[PDB]
Amino acid sequence: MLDAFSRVVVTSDAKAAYVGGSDLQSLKSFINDGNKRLDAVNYIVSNASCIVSDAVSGMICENPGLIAPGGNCYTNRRMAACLRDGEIILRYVSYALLAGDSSVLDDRCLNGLKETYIALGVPTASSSRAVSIMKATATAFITNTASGRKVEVAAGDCQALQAEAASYFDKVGSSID
Amino acid sequence: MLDAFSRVVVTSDAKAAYVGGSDLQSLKSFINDGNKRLDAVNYIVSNASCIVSDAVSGMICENPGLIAPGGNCYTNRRMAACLRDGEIILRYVSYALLAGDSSVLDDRCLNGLKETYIALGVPTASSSRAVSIMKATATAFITNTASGRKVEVAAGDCQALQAEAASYFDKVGSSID
Amino acid sequence: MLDAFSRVVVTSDAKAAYVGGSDLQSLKSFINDGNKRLDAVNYIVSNASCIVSDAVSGMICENPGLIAPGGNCYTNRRMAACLRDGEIILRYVSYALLAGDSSVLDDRCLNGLKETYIALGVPTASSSRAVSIMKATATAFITNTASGRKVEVAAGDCQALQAEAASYFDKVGSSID
Amino acid sequence: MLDAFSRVVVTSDAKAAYVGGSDLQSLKSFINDGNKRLDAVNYIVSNASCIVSDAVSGMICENPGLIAPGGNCYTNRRMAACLRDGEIILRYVSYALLAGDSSVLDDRCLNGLKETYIALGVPTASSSRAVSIMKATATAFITNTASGRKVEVAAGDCQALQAEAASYFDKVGSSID
Amino acid sequence: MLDAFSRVVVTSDAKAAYVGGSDLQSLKSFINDGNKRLDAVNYIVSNASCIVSDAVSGMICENPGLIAPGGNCYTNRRMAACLRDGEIILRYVSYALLAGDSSVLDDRCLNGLKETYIALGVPTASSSRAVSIMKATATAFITNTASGRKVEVAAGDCQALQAEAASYFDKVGSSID
Amino acid sequence: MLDAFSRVVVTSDAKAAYVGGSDLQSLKSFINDGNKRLDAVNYIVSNASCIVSDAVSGMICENPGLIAPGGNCYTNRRMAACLRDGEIILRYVSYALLAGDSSVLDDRCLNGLKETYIALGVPTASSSRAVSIMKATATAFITNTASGRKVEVAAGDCQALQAEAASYFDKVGSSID
Amino acid sequence: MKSVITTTISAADAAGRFPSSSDLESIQGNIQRAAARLEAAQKLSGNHEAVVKEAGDACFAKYSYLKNAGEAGDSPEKINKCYRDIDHYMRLINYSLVVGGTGPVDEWGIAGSREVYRALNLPGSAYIAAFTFTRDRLCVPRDMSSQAGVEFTSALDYVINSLC
Amino acid sequence: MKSVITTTISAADAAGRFPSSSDLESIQGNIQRAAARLEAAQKLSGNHEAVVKEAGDACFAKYSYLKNAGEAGDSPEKINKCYRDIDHYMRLINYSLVVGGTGPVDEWGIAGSREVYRALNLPGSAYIAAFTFTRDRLCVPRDMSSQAGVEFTSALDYVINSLC
Amino acid sequence: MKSVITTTISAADAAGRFPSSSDLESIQGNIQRAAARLEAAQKLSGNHEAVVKEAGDACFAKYSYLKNAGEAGDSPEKINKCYRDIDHYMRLINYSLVVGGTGPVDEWGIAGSREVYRALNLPGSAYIAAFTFTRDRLCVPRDMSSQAGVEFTSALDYVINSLC
Amino acid sequence: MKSVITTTISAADAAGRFPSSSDLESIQGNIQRAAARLEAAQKLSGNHEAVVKEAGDACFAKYSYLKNAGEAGDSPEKINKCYRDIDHYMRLINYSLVVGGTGPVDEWGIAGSREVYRALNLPGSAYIAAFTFTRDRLCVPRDMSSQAGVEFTSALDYVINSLC
Amino acid sequence: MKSVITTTISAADAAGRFPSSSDLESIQGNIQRAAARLEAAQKLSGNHEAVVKEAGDACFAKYSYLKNAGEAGDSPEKINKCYRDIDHYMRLINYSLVVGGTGPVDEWGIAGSREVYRALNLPGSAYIAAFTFTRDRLCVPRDMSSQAGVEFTSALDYVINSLC
Amino acid sequence: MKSVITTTISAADAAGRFPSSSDLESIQGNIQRAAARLEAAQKLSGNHEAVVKEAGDACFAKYSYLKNAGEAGDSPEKINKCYRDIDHYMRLINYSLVVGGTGPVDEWGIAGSREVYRALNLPGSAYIAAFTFTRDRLCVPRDMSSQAGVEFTSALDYVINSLC
């Protein structure tokens, strides 16, 4: 997998170029905003159970057919598998946010997910919805604007990190359906 | 795998319905004719070698090309593999007859058989013939009308079990060619 | 795998024929020229490193783009993998030459090589070139006309063995691109 | 593994003697008391969690040092492992009771249990105590004399089943300590 | 494993001495008697089933308790296992005879054989007897003096091969008992 | 494995005591000297090949019988295996130095090393000597007093790190011999 | 789906054997015992709405705290899902009694249940309260025969043991 | 030793499960069928010498070639071992009927038999003759009840299939 | 025991590598962050009795049903074991803060907890209440510095997530 | 197809090695021995019809019982298949002698032979009778040279040992 | 690409864990140390042509034999490839310093290097000569700060150790 | 120890086969080729001091840089170890020629050589020079017969390929 730094390195390597100047510039900003990134990650992991259960439950309340006989969330086994998938996706999104690059998510998670869902009969459109609800919650926690929880932290602009986190959820969503 | 009882259970589950009334009715008949079913199964297993060798040999005497150079039954290795396939098919049909449902046969035997045969160059039409000869013999043993063997048993109507056993062989045959 | 002898045996078996007469004739020639065959094989294996490094280096000097950023021989890992593939191909060609039949080469080497290369993005046309250079060198060593090395041996006609060795390299080449 | 019947078979075989007469009498009694045996097992499995938690908890309240730091039941990991072992032992004893022979208990559970405990530092004397309490509970359930739970059952004598079950727990105990 | 030649090599290496002079003389004799060695092995393998069944049967007729209930050759499973062991021992002795060194026998067959037998309760003294009879038969075949079978062969002396073969069987015997 | 911090945690846990006061003082020193520790490790790993080859070579020049035929360093295979072992031991000692605890060395390297050496016939006394030389070199590099190589570093005291490193090598030595 | 039939056939299949004596004999067990379990299943299907209402009332009567803000029964919809769940378990028990094995309840009710209840904050004791109540409520021969009762009770004890 | 009890327990042990409904129900099959097989076992116990003598005579009558020099019964000692073998199988069939599974005959008679008979030149058809004769000679209810006869017949057919 | 040091060393050991740049740099994270977590550890060390008492009171106030007959705190001895448990977690959180990783709480508190609590009927929500209360009760800089507080909060959230 | 060539190349291939000295030397063995085995193969192809008739006559002369109703030679067609089989073995032996290894007979004649003969009731002793006869019938130097004879005999003993 | 970030995430991923304290703390290491390594990387990118010329001159000044017929530097093109290679290593070191780990040099420079140099007759000592020269040539604080120098030196020692 | 005999026996052992035709025929290769290789072994035995001295001189003449301070032959003791190494290879080649396979040189000389030479800074080209010189210096029939020479040459080429 790659991180924000190696991503820059593979791009330079393609041009057999040393990394310096304008290249180092964005990496120094990454380092400069490193503490904010760690908080954003901490916010997501610290409310992981809340984010997943709420998104899965949200997907269900909007589409009750998921729990009717024959629905993909019907029986505890399926509901458990769905909750688990939700947690795995959030886990890979948190890794991507920690690394500042979607490489891990793409390679170890998204890589063949849609295919698996189609083969399992897992509804992709319902999955996208669970993911978009997680996006909503995670973006809220990152900016400390979550309705049911507020934490102490040095105030500042975390708009870039939340847009980044959001981009990761969107990637999952678009690769699924 | 499913059996006569769970087959009824999966059908009710799709309608989130308890099993009762008319559903229990056919299962009580299954139980009621349980001894006959055990005899039918016993008849097939007790003459297994006879059923397989006769069907494989029968397939060959009708299509001598199977043992000519290049034929799929040419060389002891191939003949052994064919006899073995015959025994495996009869074994799964006997399981289906014991369970009162084709689930085991479909899942653990028929599941991808044709594909394997096509890849191996195993003649599907010759296989269907070996299966239909086994059907003939097995149906005869079930009704105790086999030409070379008669056994003692309380006389009664086993027409339903033989039609059922027959349906299993037909399933194999139709999934093969 | 098959060798010169079993190749004759599988051909006779298809006609359920004993091997004799004209069939034995070519096999006796094989035996008759056995010492020459062993020398040809010895010549290839004794200069294996030379044949591979020269062919891989030759492929590169004719197509420098192979070592430019993004080229399939760029980075030591890729160059090592390429040298290794070259050695493996020569190894299987030497086996084919020792056996007097391409069976081993076809089955254990060529079997799915092109597919692997296409999947890996390994340039097939560059591979064919490395193979054709190896052919050139190996054919030269077999006839003892290599520019940088001459050995002592009873003089004689090894034209058939070199055309045979050549046919093996051509098989690899044509199955690759 | 053996059961009541094959146990008689292995004993007869040692003298190349057929099973008949007196031997069968012991086994016909087994059949005759078959229903009581099935209830005895059902009573143990139906109260499995209660029998296990009460014995492990009983083992602890009698020796609180087991839960003190350094104690073998200190940390949730160790308590869970002990609960599990308790369950495993009761599961094997219930198998032995169902089979009417300690074979399965001896070979798949007790064989090397002491070695294991000594190596891990698991206190064998405490283990024996846990097993004793389980024995007191299981034997109480078999005879339907358990304080906190009574079931409806045809009145009759099950003392032989209680003693047989007790001997199995006793076997675990003497093999452990 | 080692053979006659590498055995000489390992001995010379212990003194960092090249192989030459006297050492080679022993090995040139090996070559000179190579054809007789090949016949000796051929005689053993060509009569393998006879040598094995006769020795195991001989072992039994001398100690009928081996086939009594409780005996180590009682049941078809045990008789088959003993026949197989007999075959395995003769197979390794034939390897040792072909190599002109006990290396393969010592490392791949005898190493830990006694341990194994003691653990299983396989009677080592009976095993030795089986091996002795095999020795009597194999040595009889090597010298073409077997009662029930004579072959056509260039007349000559093979006493050294007979003694070498006998020493291998003797090695099995002293390692077992 | 444990490190300086969890070592304190396991010791406190034994008394169900929280970590605080005096305990933390030892660990705050660890933090304070963290940079010196990182240099100490860097010095060992940056001169790893030199430390290893010099000690194995030193072990040999002091006991030339190690390279005589029959010696444990005779043949390239054995010399390579010894070089590798030397590297492995230095790698584990460097891990212990980085962690500030011998845990990783004890469990993943020393546990059963003597057993292994005795079984293989690896001379434990020579091994100790190799380890001693490595100790002399590593400790020389930590204090930047190595003869053939000096580095630029903030001047300060690293005697505690040198002694800690020395104790790890000493541990390898006393466990081996 | 675990039953006498599937267990016996799976064991024969794993060993590549045709059904033999012990396989046919184990199925005679189905023949004998079916009457008892099919009576229990039939009673349950005919009176499940009543059984479930009682079980759910028993649960909430014992754990009124579930009705507190933030708990599993803090709203009408939540409470309805609770009864619905007890119904689902009762339906699976009916299936289990019909199949003569725990397969249905194992695969459709028990499997993954612990992850779901942990995630959704559904206390196991509440379910245990509902099942323990139903089990102790059984009245023989009033509700069913002795053997049907034993079958109904074992099934319930099996489900109770799954949350313990 | 394959039986309803060991098969059921092994399946439960593999899944790490306590015995459950289907396991208990399987054993009810034992309780129900024991009568028929134990009767067959009993009849075979008290009349095995006669049964064996006839089966052995049957074999040597159909295959007199066996008494020829070099064959499996070319001496009195070999002929005796033949009847002795027939007796071992009948004893194992007795065991199998007692156990209610083929375990005894599988492990003690069938396993390794093909290697032993191949190595010792004992044609399988001779054993088959002995067994086919014993099976067809069975007369119901003269020798035993109908169901004891079915059990006896199944056991012999099981052994005959193991040889072809 | 999961920490920056053991994680880094285990990764290097798996690859058979000597520590290299990234390994050394990882440990610089220790040097930098130790101050905040050790402070939190320190504050928790010197004030744990008070912290535990409050968390336990918080739990029994929110779930008084626990004191009912048959529940987890139906006797003084059980109530004490409850506070004792809360103290063990705080002690493990102290350890985790000292170690700079979740190793201590993972191996000594979390592992096996779900089985133990299921077997002993200890509702996870009661522990969650105790921990949520302790977390939200944290006041900065009154109880400790902002970053020591962030470390303390993360540790409690880590434990709360392990129960749901 | 097992031969000196395939055995030596397979061993080199498994170790990822180019052919080396011992590989080239083992093949010199082919060079030397080919004359002997190719003579035997040639004699066999030229006179196989006669060899097979004798072998088949020898088989039936020894086991006249095969001609009995229900046996392997109870009809003209069955008897013809018997000679045909001996021919197939002789053809495979010719192949084996040409290849200089047992590959052909192993893969095309021996493999699965025991399952086929067991299933079709084809007594191994009959085949052994045919091969033993042919082997003992060989007359050197009348039929072939000494070494061709040794090669022909080994091949036959190899096939005989496969049914034992 | 080995770095603090990928090492920490890979370890969490292998255990199926969300990032936790120790993961966040190891990354603080990046934050602290980046300045030092990014300075070294920047110095290298700005002056690499000069550094490489010196390193290559140092190599050939020490091993003039490479210029002999048949050696690695026996032609202009060969010599140019030598400097080009040193440049490639220096570029990979720059990448390694930017990434804060050896990933780039490991995967793109070191991996397979030993097979390539052995095959092409490229003496490792020549490369070692070039890298040893560059390392000993570093002048602090003339060329870079102390810590940037330590980072530059470790990277070089890492590459030197790869050829030893 | 790789030879025709051990290769053939290992292949047969892996398949659980008794030696058969192809195995015996492989060994006939030994009988045929032993003369040539044993002669080469013999010549090398009686003239190794001279052979080694020349190969060593050849190496240091082509690579005088080796005698420079810091290189592989920078002292008399190192120069001696160089000739000693050349002698060990010639001794292993002698062994390989006696054995008729590369086993001796593979296990005692080649295995681990690349690690040892990398660790001790012994350039492979120096060994290659020594061996290429010895190989090309071979004069037939002056030093030995043509085929003994072919065997000697093959052995050296085998060792040279192991270094590049």
PDB file of N, CA and C in Angstrom, chain A residues 47-61 79 82-84 86-87 90 130 133-134 137, chain G residues 115-121, chain I residues 161 164:
ATOM      1  N   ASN A  47     -15.778   6.530  17.830  1.00  0.00           N
ATOM      2  CA  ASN A  47     -17.224   6.448  17.688  1.00  0.00           C
ATOM      3  C   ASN A  47     -17.575   5.427  16.617  1.00  0.00           C
ATOM      4  N   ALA A  48     -16.702   4.442  16.431  1.00  0.00           N
ATOM      5  CA  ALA A  48     -16.904   3.435  15.396  1.00  0.00           C
ATOM      6  C   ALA A  48     -18.194   2.640  15.508  1.00  0.00           C
ATOM      7  N   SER A  49     -18.487   2.133  16.702  1.00  0.00           N
ATOM      8  CA  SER A  49     -19.694   1.338  16.924  1.00  0.00           C
ATOM      9  C   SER A  49     -20.927   2.176  16.622  1.00  0.00           C
ATOM     10  N   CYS A  50     -20.906   3.409  17.095  1.00  0.00           N
ATOM     11  CA  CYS A  50     -21.985   4.343  16.881  1.00  0.00           C
ATOM     12  C   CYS A  50     -22.190   4.611  15.387  1.00  0.00           C
ATOM     13  N   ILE A  51     -21.110   4.844  14.653  1.00  0.00           N
ATOM     14  CA  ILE A  51     -21.204   5.127  13.213  1.00  0.00           C
ATOM     15  C   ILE A  51     -21.786   3.943  12.414  1.00  0.00           C
ATOM     16  N   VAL A  52     -21.296   2.742  12.700  1.00  0.00           N
ATOM     17  CA  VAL A  52     -21.750   1.557  11.975  1.00  0.00           C
ATOM     18  C   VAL A  52     -23.202   1.145  12.283  1.00  0.00           C
ATOM     19  N   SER A  53     -23.532   0.997  13.560  1.00  0.00           N
ATOM     20  CA  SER A  53     -24.873   0.582  13.964  1.00  0.00           C
ATOM     21  C   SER A  53     -25.918   1.587  13.500  1.00  0.00           C
ATOM     22  N   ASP A  54     -25.588   2.869  13.591  1.00  0.00           N
ATOM     23  CA  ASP A  54     -26.511   3.908  13.153  1.00  0.00           C
ATOM     24  C   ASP A  54     -26.708   3.886  11.627  1.00  0.00           C
ATOM     25  N   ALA A  55     -25.641   3.647  10.861  1.00  0.00           N
ATOM     26  CA  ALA A  55     -25.743   3.595   9.397  1.00  0.00           C
ATOM     27  C   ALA A  55     -26.467   2.347   8.916  1.00  0.00           C
ATOM     28  N   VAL A  56     -26.195   1.220   9.560  1.00  0.00           N
ATOM     29  CA  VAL A  56     -26.854  -0.015   9.167  1.00  0.00           C
ATOM     30  C   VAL A  56     -28.328   0.080   9.562  1.00  0.00           C
ATOM     31  N   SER A  57     -28.597   0.539  10.778  1.00  0.00           N
ATOM     32  CA  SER A  57     -29.970   0.704  11.222  1.00  0.00           C
ATOM     33  C   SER A  57     -30.683   1.725  10.341  1.00  0.00           C
ATOM     34  N   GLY A  58     -29.960   2.756   9.908  1.00  0.00           N
ATOM     35  CA  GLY A  58     -30.537   3.780   9.051  1.00  0.00           C
ATOM     36  C   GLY A  58     -30.919   3.225   7.691  1.00  0.00           C
ATOM     37  N   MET A  59     -30.051   2.387   7.126  1.00  0.00           N
ATOM     38  CA  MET A  59     -30.311   1.749   5.835  1.00  0.00           C
ATOM     39  C   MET A  59     -31.617   0.930   5.938  1.00  0.00           C
ATOM     40  N   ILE A  60     -31.768   0.236   7.058  1.00  0.00           N
ATOM     41  CA  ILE A  60     -32.938  -0.593   7.322  1.00  0.00           C
ATOM     42  C   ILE A  60     -34.239   0.203   7.507  1.00  0.00           C
ATOM     43  N   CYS A  61     -34.214   1.272   8.305  1.00  0.00           N
ATOM     44  CA  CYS A  61     -35.442   2.045   8.528  1.00  0.00           C
ATOM     45  C   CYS A  61     -35.947   2.731   7.258  1.00  0.00           C
ATOM     46  N   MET A  79     -27.714 -10.094   9.351  1.00  0.00           N
ATOM     47  CA  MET A  79     -27.584  -8.795  10.015  1.00  0.00           C
ATOM     48  C   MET A  79     -26.149  -8.660  10.589  1.00  0.00           C
ATOM     49  N   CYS A  82     -23.770  -8.004   7.767  1.00  0.00           N
ATOM     50  CA  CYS A  82     -23.920  -6.631   7.310  1.00  0.00           C
ATOM     51  C   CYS A  82     -23.236  -5.652   8.271  1.00  0.00           C
ATOM     52  N   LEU A  83     -23.471  -5.806   9.567  1.00  0.00           N
ATOM     53  CA  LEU A  83     -22.831  -4.939  10.558  1.00  0.00           C
ATOM     54  C   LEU A  83     -21.305  -5.052  10.419  1.00  0.00           C
ATOM     55  N   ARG A  84     -20.838  -6.278  10.216  1.00  0.00           N
ATOM     56  CA  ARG A  84     -19.424  -6.578  10.075  1.00  0.00           C
ATOM     57  C   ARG A  84     -18.846  -5.889   8.837  1.00  0.00           C
ATOM     58  N   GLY A  86     -20.022  -3.251   7.464  1.00  0.00           N
ATOM     59  CA  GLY A  86     -20.025  -1.834   7.748  1.00  0.00           C
ATOM     60  C   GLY A  86     -18.774  -1.433   8.510  1.00  0.00           C
ATOM     61  N   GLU A  87     -18.413  -2.239   9.503  1.00  0.00           N
ATOM     62  CA  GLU A  87     -17.244  -1.992  10.343  1.00  0.00           C
ATOM     63  C   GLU A  87     -15.946  -2.128   9.560  1.00  0.00           C
ATOM     64  N   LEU A  90     -15.615   1.012   7.356  1.00  0.00           N
ATOM     65  CA  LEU A  90     -15.189   2.164   8.132  1.00  0.00           C
ATOM     66  C   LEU A  90     -13.713   2.007   8.529  1.00  0.00           C
ATOM     67  N   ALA A 130     -25.825   2.751   3.295  1.00  0.00           N
ATOM     68  CA  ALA A 130     -25.212   2.564   4.609  1.00  0.00           C
ATOM     69  C   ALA A 130     -23.904   3.348   4.641  1.00  0.00           C
ATOM     70  N   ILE A 133     -24.509   7.072   4.902  1.00  0.00           N
ATOM     71  CA  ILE A 133     -24.894   7.502   6.237  1.00  0.00           C
ATOM     72  C   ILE A 133     -23.636   7.563   7.112  1.00  0.00           C
ATOM     73  N   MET A 134     -22.713   6.612   6.919  1.00  0.00           N
ATOM     74  CA  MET A 134     -21.475   6.582   7.690  1.00  0.00           C
ATOM     75  C   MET A 134     -20.680   7.820   7.356  1.00  0.00           C
ATOM     76  N   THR A 137     -22.081  10.750   9.309  1.00  0.00           N
ATOM     77  CA  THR A 137     -21.684  10.723  10.707  1.00  0.00           C
ATOM     78  C   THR A 137     -20.206  10.986  10.922  1.00  0.00           C
TER      79      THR A 137
ATOM     80  N   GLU G 115     -23.472 -10.848  18.018  1.00  0.00           N
ATOM     81  CA  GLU G 115     -22.897  -9.631  17.476  1.00  0.00           C
ATOM     82  C   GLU G 115     -23.995  -8.613  17.277  1.00  0.00           C
ATOM     83  N   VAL G 116     -25.155  -9.076  16.842  1.00  0.00           N
ATOM     84  CA  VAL G 116     -26.270  -8.175  16.611  1.00  0.00           C
ATOM     85  C   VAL G 116     -26.790  -7.517  17.893  1.00  0.00           C
ATOM     86  N   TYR G 117     -26.977  -8.304  18.944  1.00  0.00           N
ATOM     87  CA  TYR G 117     -27.506  -7.777  20.196  1.00  0.00           C
ATOM     88  C   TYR G 117     -26.513  -6.862  20.898  1.00  0.00           C
ATOM     89  N   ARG G 118     -25.229  -7.171  20.755  1.00  0.00           N
ATOM     90  CA  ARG G 118     -24.162  -6.348  21.320  1.00  0.00           C
ATOM     91  C   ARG G 118     -24.179  -5.008  20.570  1.00  0.00           C
ATOM     92  N   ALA G 119     -24.232  -5.071  19.244  1.00  0.00           N
ATOM     93  CA  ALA G 119     -24.238  -3.855  18.442  1.00  0.00           C
ATOM     94  C   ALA G 119     -25.458  -2.979  18.665  1.00  0.00           C
ATOM     95  N   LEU G 120     -26.621  -3.604  18.794  1.00  0.00           N
ATOM     96  CA  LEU G 120     -27.853  -2.856  18.969  1.00  0.00           C
ATOM     97  C   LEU G 120     -28.274  -2.673  20.417  1.00  0.00           C
ATOM     98  N   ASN G 121     -27.419  -3.060  21.355  1.00  0.00           N
ATOM     99  CA  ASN G 121     -27.731  -2.897  22.780  1.00  0.00           C
ATOM    100  C   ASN G 121     -29.027  -3.630  23.138  1.00  0.00           C
TER     101      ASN G 121
ATOM    102  N   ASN I 161     -16.119   0.754  23.136  1.00  0.00           N
ATOM    103  CA  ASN I 161     -16.352   0.096  21.847  1.00  0.00           C
ATOM    104  C   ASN I 161     -16.180  -1.409  21.907  1.00  0.00           C
ATOM    105  N   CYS I 164     -19.663  -2.972  22.763  1.00  0.00           N
ATOM    106  CA  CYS I 164     -20.784  -2.794  21.839  1.00  0.00           C
ATOM    107  C   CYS I 164     -20.300  -2.811  20.395  1.00  0.00           C
TER     108      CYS I 164
END
